[PDB]
Amino acid sequence: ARWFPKTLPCDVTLDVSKNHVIVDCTDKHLTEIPGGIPTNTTNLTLTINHIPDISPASFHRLVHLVEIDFRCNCVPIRLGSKSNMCPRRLQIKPRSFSGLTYLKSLYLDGNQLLEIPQGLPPSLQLLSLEANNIFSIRKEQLTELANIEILYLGQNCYYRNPCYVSYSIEKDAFLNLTKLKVLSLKDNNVTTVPTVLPSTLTELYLYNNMIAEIQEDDFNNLNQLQILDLSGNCPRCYNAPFPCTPCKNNSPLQIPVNAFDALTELKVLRLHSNSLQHVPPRWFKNINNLQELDLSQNFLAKEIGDAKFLHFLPNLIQLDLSFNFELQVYRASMNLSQAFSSLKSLKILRIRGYVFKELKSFQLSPLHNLQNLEVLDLGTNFIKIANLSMFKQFKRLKVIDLSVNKISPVLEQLYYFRYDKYARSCRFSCYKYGQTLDLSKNSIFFIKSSDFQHLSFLKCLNLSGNLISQTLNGSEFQPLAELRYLDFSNNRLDLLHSTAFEELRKLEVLDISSNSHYFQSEGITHMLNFTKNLKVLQKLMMNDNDISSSTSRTMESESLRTLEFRGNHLDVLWRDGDNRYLQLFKNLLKLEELDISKNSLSFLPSGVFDGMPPNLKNLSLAKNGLKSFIWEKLRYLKNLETLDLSHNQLTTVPERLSNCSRSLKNLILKNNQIRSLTKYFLQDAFQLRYLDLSSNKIQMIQKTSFPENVLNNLKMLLLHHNRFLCTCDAVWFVWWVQHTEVTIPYLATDVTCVGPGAHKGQSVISLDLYTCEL
């Protein structure tokens, strides 16, 4: 169905609306720009390769190029591969770009360059040079960038990529860049705010540098500035997980009280890790539009209790005051100044790392009438005592986050303590349910109904990762009449009573995963038929519980649709000869998705499929060490659409898959030991739409196994990483792969000959087999 097979090792794509032809050669182990790129190419990406040089021949025929992404073909020593270090800088020969008359965006990050490349076309609006070795900016080297609007020069001199001197910027270096909207000089060992900057600036990024003082007039003209980030000049270095040098004498970044006067358009101000001890109200006299303010990682512990500056910020949406605690101090309580009540627009307030023993309801009173408040984040505060009923005055909130505290009777895992949370890479929850009380990672070991008094409004409660080691009998959550999602994972649930959780009469999702403790000790009673009582439960997760025994023999539900039962011991419950648990899931009448991967099921006893509930659609048996599989038994599963058998030990496929399942749509067989396909494998498998045979040991595929009326249905067909043998016997397969319309990922990189000798390591897509036709 293809007259000319695609041989270029890049994903080519057409967006005819925007007349873009996209050529993506990301990470193709290329040592030169591959030949045969479409001359109509607009966007060409060549990141993560080892192309040693660029020359006029590089883009010679590609005169329609709007964007060139040529990053990380020589990433600096400490940043890149240690197995494949780049030997020498990328070389850009003269005139390599001057011919690309339409080029608007040029990325040359991560190539160890020493200087701003010259000869760039005046069409250019974005130039990116992060992670190079350019640490001295001269106004002459910038003349060529007249029409530039976006300029990234950061990460060219910092601990992971040192230049061993200060960053140097000539006076007015940037001033004649009259269209410059975004200037990024982060992570560069800069020592003063470069001046004068063009008043066209909208975004200025100066963070993680060596700037100790702001001059009064450093931002005098930037009356279009919207984002200003000065974070990490004079850093707070306590528990920093990267090398950190503070300003002498514990000095803060010194900011004159009038330094922001010109910034009437400022929407974002970031002063993270600037070791500040005061926030002068004078700063915000002529900024009335500020929406986002980060003051995390300073020394504002006392200022939080005063905080007059908040009276000047009526339009503020986000305020972050996290990690301002005084060292070695465990405060008794949280002193929140009354000034917080003047933050009429506040949607998000974050005060992690204040560190205090006891939170009591009045202390949050400055917040009571903040009508727009959606998120209150008091995590990582070592709170020991908290009456949860105080949040009855915060029903309007979407998330109350008390994660990581010591209470007893989304942001990244590493966020406040990383070096550059916004660093670019070489390539490129229950909040939905309503009000959420996150109590995860606390010290709750016993819960009683009263603990939730006055919180009937809660829709999701996260008790994950506490110490609850208790038999729940339905009396513990009584007030939570509207709860839809309970995350109870990483506790020590003791399912003695089949009335556990039955008081949560609106519960749709229940996670009791990683509660393996009591299931790990022999002879203890576990009631798995507790599902009968939850009449609107859709989804149950009981993964990684080590379940090997069960007092009850069947689980019952008239509502349950998804059961995650992964990481347990169904091999033990279904031990050959023991018939008592073969219908464990049969009475989950509405169940459509069953995950019983990672259950040590090296074989499936007869009765397992007959015992499945009648509407099972999607079944995972992955990661089981399955050594054998009687495919005929799929006939029992009359609504089976997806079968995941990945990461097992299967060595054969069924003789005729049609004769096994008349419903099967998605068959996943990846990472098995299959060495050949049956003669008529896919014959009349008219329902088949997705087939993954990748990561096996297949040598040959004949036409009988792959009828073309079945292959034209297939949305995807995975074959990479097999042991394909490219003799003349393989002529049909090699022809078909090269000429097929079917989607086959990784033809450029992992559909390969193992032999014979002559062809080893060669791609099947490039194979020439004419010698078989003489």
Added chain:
Amino acid sequence: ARWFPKTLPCDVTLDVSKNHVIVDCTDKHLTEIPGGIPTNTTNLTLTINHIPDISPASFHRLVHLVEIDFRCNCVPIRLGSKSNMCPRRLQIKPRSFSGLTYLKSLYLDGNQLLEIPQGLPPSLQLLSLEANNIFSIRKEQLTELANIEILYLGQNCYYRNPCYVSYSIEKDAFLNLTKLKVLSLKDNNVTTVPTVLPSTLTELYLYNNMIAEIQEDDFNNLNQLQILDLSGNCPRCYNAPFPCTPCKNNSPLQIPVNAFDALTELKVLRLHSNSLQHVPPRWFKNINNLQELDLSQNFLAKEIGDAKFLHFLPNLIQLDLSFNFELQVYRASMNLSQAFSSLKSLKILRIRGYVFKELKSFQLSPLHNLQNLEVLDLGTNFIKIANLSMFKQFKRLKVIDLSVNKISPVLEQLYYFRYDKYARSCRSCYKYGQTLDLSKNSIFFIKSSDFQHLSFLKCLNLSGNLISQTLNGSEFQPLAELRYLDFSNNRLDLLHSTAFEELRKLEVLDISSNSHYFQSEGITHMLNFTKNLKVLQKLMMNDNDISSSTSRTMESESLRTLEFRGNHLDVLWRDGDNRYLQLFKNLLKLEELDISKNSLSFLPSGVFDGMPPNLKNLSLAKNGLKSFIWEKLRYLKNLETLDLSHNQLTTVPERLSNCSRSLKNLILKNNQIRSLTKYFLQDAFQLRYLDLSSNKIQMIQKTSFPENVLNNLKMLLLHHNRFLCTCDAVWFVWWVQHTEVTIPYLATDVTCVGPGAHKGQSVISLDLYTCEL
């Protein structure tokens, strides 16, 4: 160095003292008995193969055989592999054994046999027929076994291997076996004690059967019986993890009170899981030698508070009363009868699964004067309250076991609840002194007062509790002699570097799986807490997810072993951050360092220089190491063991001599090594163990493997490679065939991948004569 290569796929071994020639073909995927077994062979083992038949030709020349182990060549369907089910029972032709005039032991278990193989020699003393399909014993079929002493007939009819009828035994079938010492009829669907039995019996095993009643005289003559197991007749089925059918009418196994009268020599009596509700003293009137008595898995809850029968047991060493609780009852406390005080000889007492809320010192008083008591096991009792100071009255004990309870302010994991704990297969801190095992409880806070009066303790097990606390050294004051502290699986918060410093006798500390507080950014961790513990030998901090540390050095002048696996040294040693490159340098006496599973895809320069000076055994396994500067091994001047298994290395050093000139054991299994450097092992004279298995090597030439270096080797592992058996391979193939050096799996996984002709062929059998024409 060998003139005739061994080609037999069996390990041949000679113990000339007992003039035994042992030939072990266990699990060699054999479909016939290999030819060429040494004629002098004594023990021949052929278990786990697929030999379909035995015939007179089988052992024709092997007339010196004392033992034949021929088990599991046709395992019953539900017991064996389901990927390779045996298609048809093993077939034993007439005369197969009559010629083996010296044959004393014959194992034919797990072969799906239907009948007792006949024609056995009169020399035979042990016959084993477990896991076959023999469920009818006839006295006629037993004549040939005149001189037999050990006879195993169990597992021929049970849930995993059903026969669908009752087991049948003709009367006096065993009586003329005048030398018969041990008879095992376990797991057999037996319905009465077979009679009469030969009085020569010492061990009789009838457990897991369908015996509903013992007759008065069933054991009348067995006055040499030493062990009797009747367990699992009328079983207690509550929470049984196997199919379990109780005796009707909630009846127990009925034993008339005089049934044991003849059993004067009985040392062990096992009545586990017989649904008993009473233990009549009359049973034990004429046994005073009893040492071991199992009464677990009955219904003796009340009888434990009465227990008159114990007065008849002054010689008893072990007593097990575990899992007698009455269903649905959570007693307030443990009523132990005073009769326990009469167990003058008792060393081990076990009462798991009594199930009661509060244990207090008075309940244990009957135990106060049992001077020989060594073990008290009160686990799985759901105890909520226990003043631990009550054990001040038990300093003499070796183990006080409160594992798996609900306390708050070794036996196999499955033991009391398995079907047959003694079934045959087809093939700790106690040492340190008094041990208080509190593992798997609900302790969430520790204060010094909790250990008042327990200074005698040597090992304290707190593993698997809920301790989520900063220890400042004030929590363990009374434990002045503690040598072993297991604190794993808790939530230790190392805020204070004075943690544990009060335990000034601590030699080993496990704080593994205390990852909780290490998982959350910005929290202070003091890893230099080791400085205060002046006698600490072994520190385990495995699986803690440590990625950050306020302190930059760990300090100890005593510590010799540090387990640091499952952490994030990749983050602490992030390229460009030099501050933790000497984390371990001042562990001056450290000899063993485990930093496997640390995501170290590379080792930054400085890591090796930062190692302490006496490092002997260093594991970098399971790290995804893609690259390794072998030269930097020069810094490690005392390195004896280097474990680099399960990584992504593609090369070995150009000269291992020039890298480490002490290295004895180099482990490189499961990597991506495709070829050896030309002069690899040249002059590496101290090397004694080399594992290159599970790599992708195609060729090995003599340059890389000089023979003055390979004869050094205690072992040399090469299996699961990609060996190419062309004429280029002539030296390697010759050396493998003729070497004395031990190379495991030569029979089964040292294989040519090619070329074509030789694909899948064993290197040991390879004929390369065409290369010499």
Added chain:
RNA sequence: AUUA
């Protein structure tokens, strides 16, 4: 899990 090739007698658990």
Added chain:
RNA sequence: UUA
């Protein structure tokens, strides 16, 4: 392989 800019975190």
